[PDB]
From a paper:
A protein involved in resistance against different pathogen groups, which is only present in monocot plants, is referred to as monocot chimeric jacalin (MCJ). As its name suggests, it is a fusion of two proteins, a jacalin-related lectin (JRL) and a dirigent protein (DIR) at the N-terminus. Therefore, the development of disease resistant plants is mandatory. It was shown that the rice (Oryza sativa) protein OsJAC1 enhances resistance against different bacterial and fungal plant pathogens in rice, barley, and wheat. Here, we report crystal structures for both individual domains and the complex of galactobiose with the DIR domain, which revealed a new carbohydrate binding motif for DIR proteins.
The JRL domain has a β-prism-I fold composed of three four-stranded antiparallel β-sheets. Two of these sheets are canonical Greek key motifs, whereas in the third case the very N- and C-terminal segments of the protein join to form the outer and inner pair of strands, respectively. The two dimeric assemblies of OsJAC1-JRL superpose with a root-mean-square (RMS) distance of 0.87 Å for Cα atoms and 1.24 Å for all non-hydrogen atoms (using residue range 160–306 in all subunits). The dimer itself features C2 symmetry with constituent chains being more similar in crystal form 1 of the OsJAC1-JRL domain (Cα RMS distance 0.58 Å) than in JRL-cf2 (Cα RMS distance 1.13 Å). As indicated by PISA analysis, the extensive interface involving both hydrophobic and polar interactions buries more than 800 Å2 of solvent-accessible surface area on either protomer and is classified as stable in solution. In contrast to all other mJRLs from plants, the two chains of the non-crystallographic dimer of OsJAC1-JRL are linked via a symmetric disulfide bond formed by a cysteine residue close to the N-terminus (Cys161). Overall, the intimate interaction between subunits suggests a physiologically relevant mode of dimerization; accordingly, the disulfide bond may not just represent an artefact of crystallization under non-reducing conditions but may actually occur in the full-length protein (see Discussion section). For instance, superposition of the JRL-cf1 homo-dimer and the corresponding HADDOCK model of dimeric full-length OsJAC1 yielded an RMS distance of 0.56 Å for all Cα atoms (using residue range 160–306 in all subunits). The increased hemagglutination activity of the OsJAC1-JRL domain under oxidizing conditions points to a crucial role of the intermolecular disulfide bond that is consistently observed in both crystal forms.
Residue numbers in the entry:
A (entry chain B): 159 to 306
B (entry chain A): 160 to 306
The structure:
Amino acid sequence: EQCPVTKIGPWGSSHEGTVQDITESPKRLESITLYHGWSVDSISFTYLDHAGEKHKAGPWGGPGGDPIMIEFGSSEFLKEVSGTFGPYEGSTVITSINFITNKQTYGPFGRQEGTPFSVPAQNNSSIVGFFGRSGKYINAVGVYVQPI
Amino acid sequence: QCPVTKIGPWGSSHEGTVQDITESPKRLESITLYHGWSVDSISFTYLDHAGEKHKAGPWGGPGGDPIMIEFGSSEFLKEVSGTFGPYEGSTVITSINFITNKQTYGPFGRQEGTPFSVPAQNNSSIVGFFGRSGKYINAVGVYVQPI
């Protein structure tokens, strides 16, 4: 109860984009809405915080792409985020992303081009939120991790 | 007693013998690395939550030149990064790099192949490692302790 969250990343552009983050420490990831096309245009997500209050973060990114909304049931948790990043329209962007839970694999979204990244959380720990930098695309993405 | 966070590994899909620690690390005290073309071996000493010292490793083989990194008072490991790629028939960690809050040690090895990185934010610290090894380190992951 009230174990501090771990913040890891980001991966992607070292210095491009507007900082994006959540204000209340996250405890449970409820949904992700991802817009994607050739690259990863935007991410939004809902999460429950340290006080049991739900928030929508985002969208972080631009208005392009087609949406997919992913809702996690109470027994589903995110155990790895992976993807690629590279040059797109003159910036380094997240070109593809994947979400691997204890139940399923969602993705790839985008195009698998450029440099890989991966953040596998072990020991049944969950990825419970995100942070990063964005413009018209996601330039860099990191994760919040909460053990059990 | 909040569990440590365990992230990774990066590198070889499945080659090598699983290597891990058995106590929850609180503070990383030293790293001993052997390196040449690739990262031959890693060992480290850490403090557990009762404050006693544990040695892990070495994990890896007999090659490379040694370096011993002793963390100073108030020095902690903020990011591990490196590369992995084919070497002598397997996928190995080809280079590694230790970014502390005071200085960077590395790169050790050859910066060739596929990059990996694990930055810890908000002054959290990388306090240990795990992975798979044989003659070299095949895959490596980290333990992270938030402040």
